[PDB]
Design a protein around this ligand. Structure first.
Ligand SMILES: Cc1cc2nc3c(=O)[nH]c(=O)nc-3n(C[C@H](O)[C@H](O)[C@H](O)COP(=O)(O)O)c2cc1C
Ligand SMILES: Cc1cc2nc3c(=O)[nH]c(=O)nc-3n(C[C@H](O)[C@H](O)[C@H](O)COP(=O)(O)O)c2cc1C
Ligand SMILES: Cc1cc2nc3c(=O)[nH]c(=O)nc-3n(C[C@H](O)[C@H](O)[C@H](O)COP(=O)(O)O)c2cc1C
Ligand SMILES: Cc1cc2nc3c(=O)[nH]c(=O)nc-3n(C[C@H](O)[C@H](O)[C@H](O)COP(=O)(O)O)c2cc1C
Ligand SMILES: O=C([O-])c1nnsc1Sc1ccc(Cl)cc1
Ligand SMILES: O=C([O-])c1nnsc1Sc1ccc(Cl)cc1
Ligand SMILES: O=C([O-])c1nnsc1Sc1ccc(Cl)cc1
Ligand SMILES: O=C([O-])c1nnsc1Sc1ccc(Cl)cc1
Lengths: 360, 360, 360, 360
């Protein structure tokens, strides 16, 4: 046949058909027995919608803002590493699609494109940097300074990866970068497949060499002093940690279990979102990622108090289909599904999406 | 073999075997991942029956009334569009079967038979019109006036379809009317497969051109002033909306998720029915559709306070089997299953079907 | 292979392999979609055991009493019709096995052996009669008088079958007695396969002609006056009905959903048992049937207050394997499994099986 | 292929591929329908983890103590009988691996190696004896005295096996020791496959001849007087029994359902653990076995108050793969998974693993 891909799941199925197994598995995988991976999706199904009828939904407006910057929809691209494994244009394709859509891209720290290259490809795109605190704080500071210089509008500091999760397929497949690719923002720090990264997942060994497992809230204080950019804590799952992030002067929480790729057996993000929204008392924006595949997922997250959601894997499946055009397709599908879900539930804009729309 | 069809599921299986895939899929489909479609049936299974013994059930009486009109049983035909796709006689077959059974038919607004043709075929049948408020209010008013003139006894205004739900199979199949058929109560308004209805579901584009997504409770006020016929709000899932319908002088609520074909992830109708019954405080009759396949489904709905239920898909499967005779068969099966369920639970008539008969 | 049957499920599997489909299906079937049939077994699995350690279980005593008559174990044979369809010796085989085991047999009213024949085969066996109130009360009275004369020790009046449940396989199979067999306690009343019993289940038509659907508590008063034998109401699922049975001077409740063959969607018997035990306030013995397959099922029922349980289908599978010897095997397996369950839970006799042994 | 075994489940799959069916089944089996066997694993999945971020996990310390003896990790080898069926070196391989890992081995009473042989093989290993109270108390006392003499540091008295559970596969397979092997701490008491152990499971008959089903708390008093070694009650599932064990001067509870091999339908050990921890009020250490397969299982057990966990079947799968090296592999996998789970949840040592880390 000819691909007729009409929902995000179709893009995944296409991706599985065209990508090398090792690459598909790297993108697909969760940690260990993948309990949380299943739950990120199943949990959305347990939250039921209570639509209002007869509200006038002729002129649905999906626009909102993220950390003070306007976006066309509350659906943004989350950090996924090494996008050139899915399509030759990788992160440059992604940022161009975001520019077209009027939404934001969170650039991953082990991107196969540089901070500068991505800014050059998407100068008008809303762009943020996802950061790890590397053992080498000079590396870390340089990334932040480059993000500042190159027009990025926030730092998302990932806090759930002091070590890499155990993704069994990567170990089985002995996963590594294809030989032509590198992490472009750093030989060892660039994750060269030529370097010695052990006999298991090359990625886990790389993380153990690069990322600082000793970081504490003291290092958050350091990062807060380092930059005036908005900072979002990415990977928070507890209310008490969320309150600590507010106390440290951070500007947002991304409720995330890292796409279920870190600690397996944590709750679904949609299930912990209410706890986190309650804990921060409106003091910072709260975002969600993990398991967003459909317009109704977006609606449910916003009903429970998220400002916006991020999508990880769907973007990679877009790339695998057709680079920039494929990412645009995936974002347009999510946009249209969200528009329809809003309209059928009686919501003419995002400001009227309330907690009475959902019940578990 | 020779078809030996003894329950509603058997009629569906037969229909799948004889109908073109596109047509079967159109009839079968729910929206998106079909979560609500599954739940409309699963939810009935979770409500358990607590039968009373030794009550004298020798003379079971299934008769009741709907909006003041007597019916032989609390089981009525709900609106399903384009019935001539299932059988050459379509809506005329359906109304003749309803006349034979002594129950009512809700005629769909995109029927493949006219309001007048259906009245001529079933002059003695209890008949109601399901209405959409079209952008063209002159079209809308004409339908209501024809229903009045031709002896229809209520208007069911559908309020859950400002836009059509996303039924994936219809998009995959590029669904449209077979070339010989038309919506007979209106070229574009008649959903001619010759007209330009985009490259996706022809139906969704038709709805977007025809149905007014701007309607509000103000338009309900208009409809209430337009006709003295009883008006039922079809597609209500919230208690607050139900109370608003009562406040606007409507005469009934049809608790409906549109056969799970509109917003996916809403609750099953049997699960929201108690909320709606409580909210209206006996001021109007409350009806249910969605997932009724068996006599015990009918019993459970009445135990939870519905006056009557409507069946959608089962009627189409009856048509696909043998037109009028097939619809009669399906209605007789539901009637007999309901009679048996009543008798085995100790209910000699519908007036003694109480809330103590069920527990979730 | 050679049959090595070590649990009740193995006997069912053997039975399916040797019985004609129509006969196996008749025995196996539940009503309609068989929701309750599945639940009778699943519900036992949800009740968890909390065994006591170090109690001294060297000398486990399984003996108890039923309505004042001693039995070797709280596991008795329930009424299953037409046992000669499973084995040439039918009910005579069953009663001989009960005599050997020291347990009781409930003789079914549409038995393929007479009340007298069964008494002659098992003179020392504890025997009870399961009764329906026939439209012909002279038939009914004669059965009771024969039970009295022939040394039967109780009447179990079945109250959940004013009409037969709808067992789909029987309708599909057009089920009837094999030509050589008859209901031996009555041509039409004997369910002769030569007589006209419609085009569906022959059994349903027979029931409609024979059993009185008009019976009320007034007919229970009649039966109570008719005989001084203990009377048990069989098929009660509600506490209020249980209290009424006590008020009418009956001597026991058999909590039963008729093996899930009557109204589908009623609860599992193990789930309603606590309600019934509470409702009767120790005034009569309470028994259970439905889904008993294992020694732990027996233990759970007794923990929740049943005096004894009855088994239906397992006995038929015993017959299908090897008549009397097969029934003895099934009863011995249940006995040994129950003994082991008692011992492993710290119970040296049935008097110390308490409600703290289980939690749902 | 070449075995690439990276998690405990992989070791089981390998074991199934290389072991004779009878032997694999003996090791694998639970009792009866294996409801508890499934639940021991499923229950761990229902307990969700709530990880703390930014805690400094650069120097994770897994060490703890069991009954006053230091161990490298809270993961110890539980008693599994007849280990020479899995590998020629059996219990000697196991103890050598424990010595290498710095963890403890619980030697089973029907070991295929003597108490002395195991001590000689693992002189520096932490070793405990699992004891049954045999009808012959002289046998029983001799085992305890040998454990004392040979440097064993505790007695685990198993209290849930007055009789053996009914493991259906063992009965189907007519299980017995391979001809070259014996229980080395005792012809009949040595479970010689040459002796008469009935026609079912040889093991059940052996247990019935050897183990005293009459034991009570009075026999616990006897054992407590017999030895000054720490004594742990193994197989407790109720809080009241746990309190009795404390009252009798025992030094620990091993919350255990015997790997789901005794009474089927008891709860999962992880589900009863909180009840037991609460009941003993910190007076003795509480341990868990049953269903531990992953590092997150260990973390969940410790969060709910277990001091350490024991693993049964995983060790046997290690042996089946490669004797001592295979056991070492399995223990190292559990160690590393536990280290990662600790780090990703913010725990730098076992003392900070608290109840707020989990919610059901
Ligand atoms: C293939 C892949 C690579 C990822 N790489 C990173 C990364 O480098 N940094 C990071 O913070 N998160 C990373 N994540 C986590 C994502 O930012 C995000 O939390 C996750 O993809 C959301 O779930 P979803 O894939 O279900 O949409 C990655 C996720 C995936 C699937
Ligand atoms: C094939 C099909 C066509 C339908 N067409 C209409 C329609 O034109 N107008 C409307 O109000 N509802 C329509 N509905 C919704 C039905 O009126 C009803 O809510 C639904 O069929 C009930 O669920 P059931 O099919 O499970 O019985 C349609 C449903 C189906 C299945
Ligand atoms: C094949 C079959 C025939 C039965 N016939 C009768 C009957 O004639 N009278 C009656 O009261 N119950 C009858 N029952 C119901 C049984 O007495 C009993 O309630 C049921 O078998 C218990 O469930 P079990 O089969 O799961 O053990 C029958 C059940 C079966 C399976
Ligand atoms: C093959 C096998 C043999 C066992 N033998 C004994 C035994 O001789 N004594 C004993 O107390 N427990 C014995 N057990 C129970 C174990 O000590 C332990 O409770 C169980 O294996 C824990 O569950 P797991 O296998 O899921 O880790 C045995 C368990 C298995 C699987
Ligand atoms: O979830 C993910 O896959 C990830 N998150 N952070 S790094 C990462 S994958 C990775 C990519 C490159 C290198 Cl060198 C190490 C690890
Ligand atoms: O649930 C359903 O299928 C429906 N409900 N209203 S219209 C409809 S299908 C439809 C039929 C004809 C046309 Cl032109 C558009 C749409
Ligand atoms: O559960 C069951 O199968 C039954 N319960 N009562 S009669 C019956 S089956 C039956 C047997 C014989 C006749 Cl004539 C009619 C019906
Ligand atoms: O769970 C288990 O398998 C066991 N627990 N105690 S003995 C045992 S198995 C057993 C081994 C040897 C003998 Cl002789 C009898 C029984």
């Amino acid at each position: 046949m000819l691909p007729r891909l009409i929902c995000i799941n179709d893009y995944e199925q296409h991706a599985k058909s065209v990508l090398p197994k090792s690459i598909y598995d790297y993108y697909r995988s969760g940690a260990n027995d993948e309990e949380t991976l299943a739950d990120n999706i199943a949990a959305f199904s347990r939250w039921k919608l209570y639509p209002r009828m007869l509200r006038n939904v002729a002129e649905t407006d999906l626009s909102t803002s993220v950390l003070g910057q306007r976006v066309s929809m509350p659906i943004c691209v989350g950090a996924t590493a090494m996008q050139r494994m899915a399509h030759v244009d990788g992160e440059l394709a992604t940022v161009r699609a975001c520019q077209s859509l009027g939404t934001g891209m969170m650039l991953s720290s082990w991107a196969t494109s540089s901070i500068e290259e991505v800014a050059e490809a998407g100068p008008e795109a809303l762009r943020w940097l996802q950061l790890y605190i590397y053992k080498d704080r000079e590396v870390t500071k340089k990334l932040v300074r480059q993000a500042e210089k190159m027009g990025y509008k926030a730092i998302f500091v990932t806090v759930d990866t002091p070590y890499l999760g155990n993704r069994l397929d990567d170990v089985r497949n002995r996963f590594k970068l294809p030989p032509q690719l590198r992490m472009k923002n750093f030989s060892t720090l660039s994750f060269s497949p030529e370097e010695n990264f052990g006999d298991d997942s090359g990625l886990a060994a790389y993380v153990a060499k690069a990322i600082d497992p000793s970081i504490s809230w003291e290092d958050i204080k350091w990062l807060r002093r380092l930059t005036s950019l908005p900072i979002v804590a990415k990977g928070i799952l507890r209310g008490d940690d969320a309150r600590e992030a507010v106390k440290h002067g951070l500007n947002g929480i991304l409720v995330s279990n890292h796409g279920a790729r870190q600690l397996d057996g944590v709750p679904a993000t949609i299930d912990v979102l209410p706890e986190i929204v309650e804990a921060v008392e409106g003091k910072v924006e709260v975002f969600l990622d993990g398991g967003v595949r459909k317009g109704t997922d977006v609606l449910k997250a916003l009903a429970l108090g998220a400002k916006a959601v991020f999508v990880g894997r769907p973007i990679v499946w877009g790339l695998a289909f057709q680079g920039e055009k494929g990412v645009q397709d995936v974002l347009e599908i999510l946009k249209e599904e969200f528009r329809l879900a809003m309209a059928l539930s009686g919501c003419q804009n995002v400001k009227v999406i309330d907690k009475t729309l959902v019940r578990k």
